[PDB]
Ligand binder design. Structure first.
Ligand SMILES: Nc1ncnc2c1ncn2[C@@H]1O[C@H](COP(=O)(O)OP(=O)(O)OP(=O)(O)O)[C@@H](O)[C@H]1O
Lengths: 69, 184, 341, 50
């Protein structure tokens, strides 16, 4: 018989329920990075069909660089 | 390259049912018959409409000039097929071949369609072929072959995604749903 | 007979393929197989123990790690690069103007091996190879002498310093194996063209350095000098610029013969056009005098490319015969190519 | 040394080359037909194909 799923193995999942540290009210400086990330993360995650309507394939690729800061 | 023939379907339906219209409905039809050299489409209407008098040499020199225009492309392919390429020959013949069957009946079209379906590696010309099946499906009010290629085109289209041809198909299924009775 | 039905029961059915580590005069051989395992094997059969030598692949019978038979398996990375073949249709008779240049190298490559009777009785024996070069970008015209050589004996071509210095070395060992494999295929010809080892600017990938590059080249000289190998594996060197290579390389080889490639004259260029256009069909109005007069310092492949582009342009009209107006208009394309930048 | 290879130039994007290719990439995204492809391409000189 196979794995349920999913009972792992390793990592594991969860552990993030008692976290995270602070909300997003902290960093307000960027505002041009958040407009990219928010649209590249929470919008495709909330509505999968809205992209198929307009005929644009939402990517999953998010790359960040520049530190410091 | 469709509406000149589509309005002919309009005028054939305009002539068929009412027997009271003997003037403006035949005049525009002959106006479109003297042009594009529609040959087979007017025989079925010649049995219902008047037999004249004379057509004969007027449309015989036009169908012989259409056969000279037909045989000049048929004489261009074997000089073209001596050289070789990708689609540059077989696609050169099919468009004018479906226009040459636009002159008459379903024959040259139905052979050209299954001919070009094995040529094109993209859906661009495929769905164009489908549109030819739909326009002829309206002329001969034959709903048999238009329900098939449409089902096959929707799968190649949505693999996949489109704008112009997608919204086109949205109207096509509306024309079929209004041909039969589907209101919703 | 009965031995075939006997020894097979000892090795089979399963068996492993290991490597030989070292041999002991007690007929116990130490074998190494995946991964990191040792043993004492003593077998008196199928050996061939003297020809094996450590560093070769041997079988391992499960019980117990015994070697029934010897396996020499190639394959191998380097053995793949020597063949095959070509045996090209081109000959040394398809080139002209270098008759005075070619006479000595053709003689030097056919000096040994074929026509040995006047060589062996004279007791000369200069088996150090030959060295080629020329301007501006030729050396392929000297390769047009290697095609005739490919028609005879065995040939191998190793060109470019990238094959060593692209990564860290281990230096020459890649060349060191070429020597010995060519010794197993002796007689064979090894040709090297365009040696940039000292002429390169930027190394490939991440490797260093300018002076380590030199040391792998120097070990190539001692390999080539050499102490002590009499085998051939005849070696031929060629490049564009001989001034880059160090004079340290000339005494071991080639001390007897090196050739220089001169620029072709009017008579030679006429011959060249003759040889290429032999197979081609040209219009009656094409003359060979004005063509070579208008051209200044061009090799065979230049007059080749202008004909190739003339036939390519003639394919647009689907004509097998190239007219002189089409030929000149096509010629102006390569003429404008070299003159654009 | 001019020997041997085939010479083919890679052209920069052109206006008339921008029109058709614009439609091509516009084939996958739902839009109305009130869009003027003539004026939109002239506003983008140079740049690149990508
Ligand atoms: N006299 C001649 N007769 C016939 N062919 C000739 C003659 N001289 C030169 N050629 C041809 O012209 C060609 C010249 O080659 P070329 O020098 O262009 O090569 P290359 O591209 O420079 O090689 P590399 O880049 O390795 O230096 C040769 O292949 C040779 O066959």
């Amino acid at each position: 018989d196979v794995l349920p799923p999913e009972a792992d193995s390793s990592i594991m999942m969860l552990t993030s329920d008692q976290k995270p540290d602070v909300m997003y009210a902290d960093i307000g400086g960027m505002d041009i990075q958040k407009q990219e990330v928010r649209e590249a993360v929470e919008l495709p995650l909330t509505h999968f069909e809205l992209y198929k309507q307009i005929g644009i394939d939402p990517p999953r690729g998010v790359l960040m660089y520049g530190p410091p800061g | 390259p469709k509406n000149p023939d589509l309005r002919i379907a309009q005028l054939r339906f305009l002539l068929s049912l009412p027997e009271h219209r003997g003037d403006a409905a035949v005049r525009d039809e002959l106006m479109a018959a003297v042009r594009d050299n529609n040959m087979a489409p007017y025989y079925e209407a010649l049995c219902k409409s008047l037999d004249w008098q004379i057509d004969v040499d007027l449309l015989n020199k036009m169908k012989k000039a259409n056969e000279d225009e037909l045989k000049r492309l048929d004489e261009e392919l074997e000089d073209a097929e001596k050289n070789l390429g990708e689609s540059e020959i077989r696609d050169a013949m099919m468009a004018k071949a479906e226009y040459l069957c636009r002159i008459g009946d379903k024959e040259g079209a139905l052979t050209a369609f299954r001919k070009t379906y094995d040529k094109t590696v993209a859906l661009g010309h495929r769905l164009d072929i489908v549109f030819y099946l739909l326009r002829i499906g309206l002329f001969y009010m034959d709903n048999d072959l238009i329900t098939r290629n449409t089902e096959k085109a929707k799968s190649l289209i949505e693999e996949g995604g489109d704008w112009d041809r997608r919204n086109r198909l949205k109207v096509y299924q509306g024309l079929y749903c209004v041909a039969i009775r589907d209101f919703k | 007979e009965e031995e075939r039905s006997k020894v097979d029961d000892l090795r089979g059915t399963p068996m492993s393929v290991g490597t030989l580590e070292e041999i002991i005069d007690d007929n116990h051989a130490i074998v190494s197989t995946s991964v990191g395992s040792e043993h004492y094997v003593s077998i008196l059969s199928f050996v061939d123990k003297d020809l094996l030598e450590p560093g070769c692949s041997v079988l391992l019978n499960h019980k117990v790690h015994a070697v029934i038979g010897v396996l020499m398996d190639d394959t191998d990375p380097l053995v793949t690069v020597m063949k095959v073949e070509k045996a090209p249709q081109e000959t040394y008779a398809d080139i002209g103007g270098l008759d005075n240049q070619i006479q000595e190298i053709k003689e030097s490559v056919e000096l040994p091996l074929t026509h040995p009777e006047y060589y062996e009785e004279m007791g000369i024996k200069p088996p150090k190879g030959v060295i080629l070069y020329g301007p501006p970008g030729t050396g392929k015209t000297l390769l047009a002498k290697a095609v005739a050589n490919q028609t005879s004996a065995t040939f191998l071509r190793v060109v470019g310093s990238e094959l060593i210095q692209k990564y860290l070395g281990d230096g020459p060992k890649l060349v060191r194996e070429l020597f010995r494999v060519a010794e197993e295929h002796a007689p064979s010809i090894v040709f090297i063209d365009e040696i940039d080892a000292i002429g390169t600017k930027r190394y490939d990938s991440n490797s260093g350095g300018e002076r380590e590059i030199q040391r792998t080249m120097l070990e190539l000289l001692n390999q080539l000098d050499g102490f002590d190998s009499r085998g051939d594996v005849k070696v031929i060197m060629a490049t564009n610029r001989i001034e880059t290579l160090d004079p340290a390389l000339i005494r071991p080889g080639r001390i007897d013969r090196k050739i220089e490639f001169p620029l072709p004259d009017e008579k030679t260029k006429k011959r060249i056009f003759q040889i290429h256009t032999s197979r081609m069909t040209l219009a009656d109005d094409v003359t060979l005098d004005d063509l070579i007069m208008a051209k200044d310092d061009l090799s065979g492949a230049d007059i080749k490319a202008i004909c190739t582009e003339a036939g390519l342009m003639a394919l647009r009209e689907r004509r097998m015969k190239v007219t002189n107006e089409d030929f000149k208009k096509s010629k102006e394309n390569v003429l404008y190519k070299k003159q654009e930048g | 040394p001019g020997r041997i290879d085939r010479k083919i130039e890679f052209p920069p994007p052109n206006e008339e080359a921008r029109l058709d290719i614009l439609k091509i990439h516009s084939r996958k995204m739902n839009l109305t037909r009130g869009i003027n492809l003539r004026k939109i391409a002239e506003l983008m000189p140079g740049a690149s194909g990508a």
